[PDB]
């Protein structure tokens, strides 16, 4: 790699993230604020994604 | 609707994709019917210094 190279010859850093969703215990989750759990009634719920 | 952005944010204009521009600056709906036209402007919109 050289600084005078073209755009197609410039070095690009590639990071690929591979995921598996909703088939195992999740060590990592999105920053959604936890709310109180309400049971025995109709509610819109998001549990572990 | 007209604006000026940088190149790496141009893909953020397309509907369904997120970013700084898509989340905090300008958002298109998922059912958007229209066109996106982007062209280079480094000759006139770039100032020395």
């Amino acid at each position: 790699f050289q600084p005078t190279n073209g755009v197609g010859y410039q070095p690009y850093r590639v990071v690929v993230l591979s995921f598996e969703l909703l088939h195992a215990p999740a060590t990592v989750c999105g920053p959604k604020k936890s709310t109180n759990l309400v049971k025995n009634k109709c509610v819109n719920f998001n549990f572990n994604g | 609707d007209s604006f000026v952005i940088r190149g790496d944010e141009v893909r953020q204009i397309a509907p369904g994709q997120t970013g700084k521009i898509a989340d905090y600056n300008y958002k298109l709906p998922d059912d958007f019917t229209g066109c996106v036209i982007a062209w280079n402007s480094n000759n006139l919109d770039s100032k020395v210094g």
Partner: protein, 49 residues
Amino acid sequence: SALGKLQDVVNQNAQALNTLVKQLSSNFGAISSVLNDILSRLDPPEAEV
């Protein structure tokens, strides 16, 4: 064995209901079999499809 003919009807009715519940399980050629899962993973614009 005399009442076997009547039982046939019970077997067939139950078998058919069972076959339908089994089909409800198939992914039908998608990324996921669970409807809540595909609503979770994707934004609308291809989730409708």
